[PDB]
Amino acid sequence: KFDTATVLSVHHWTDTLFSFTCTRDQALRFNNGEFTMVGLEVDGKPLTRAYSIVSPNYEEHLEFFSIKVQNGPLTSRLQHLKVGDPVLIGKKPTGTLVADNLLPGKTLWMLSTGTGLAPFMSIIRDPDIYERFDKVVLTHTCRLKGELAYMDYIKHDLPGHEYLGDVIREKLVYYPTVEGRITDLIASGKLFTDLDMPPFSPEQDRVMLCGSTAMLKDTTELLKKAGLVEGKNSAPGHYVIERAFVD
Ligand SMILES: Cc1cc2nc3c(=O)[nH]c(=O)nc-3n(C[C@H](O)[C@H](O)[C@H](O)COP(=O)(O)OP(=O)(O)OC[C@H]3O[C@@H](n4cnc5c(N)ncnc54)[C@H](O)[C@@H]3O)c2cc1C
């Protein structure tokens, strides 16, 4: 069920965060925003975890962005990856952060906490996104030099799509929130006054959430009260959600 890929590059941005790129099987096809399984063979068995695919689907390699968890079975080992090392990559990506599950609208909001920024690193490089939205807002919890350096590097990695540089410049806004401070910024209305945007309505706003279970719970409650409905394959809506990690 796994491709054995070869690690092409490895980057340590901070003492808790690393990214890597690796070879991409021809069968690995996906929509920007989706996740797949990534792991290593440990004691003769696959040890794997869900990871958002950071790279856009037109990039010829894959990229992933990882936390280093202290006694984390996978990340305590994955952090030691070297160029040329093998890594297991799940052959079937999936996920709910899928724009086709959002009714047409004018503003796209991406509300992320922690490593939940990861799927949005792929989506903000999807040219289709700017063809269907007036403005894109990415909220995040990155505060450290190395975290911001990563997002800055990502936004310019645009193979075959250099023209998107000007589009991203014009249409994409990054809003620092620093981890469940976003819910409060919504409830108080300060998110919207800060950015000079109208409060959420299903008329206008499409929202993607990727963060903790707690952040998802509290924030969707506010979206539902504004009249927004969760989208799904069989019924596009106003918002979609995915956990950044499992409690
Ligand atoms: C759909 C999905 C997409 C994901 N995408 C990513 C990703 O792009 N990058 C990434 O680093 N992780 C991601 N995760 C979390 C990831 O799958 C692993 O749990 C993470 O790699 C840590 O694995 P581990 O074996 O070291 O620790 P685990 O044994 O998996 O967990 C150790 C503890 O750390 C907490 N934790 C785990 N991951 C994180 C995190 N990223 N941020 C904060 N706390 C965490 C968990 O609650 C867990 O209880 C994703 C999870 C899901 C469900």
UniProtKB/TrEMBL annotation:
Cited CDD domains: FNR1 (cd06195)
Cofactor: FAD
EC number(s) on file: 1.18.1.2
Molecular function per GO: ferredoxin-NADP+ reductase activity; nucleotide binding
Catalytic activity of the protein: 2 reduced [2Fe-2S]-[ferredoxin] + NADP(+) + H(+) = 2 oxidized [2Fe-2S]-[ferredoxin] + NADPH
UniProt key word Oxidoreductase: yes
GO annotation (BP), single: cellular response to oxidative stress
Protein name: ferredoxin--NADP(+) reductase
Organism: Burkholderia thailandensis (strain ATCC 700388 / DSM 13276 / CCUG 48851 / CIP 106301 / E264)
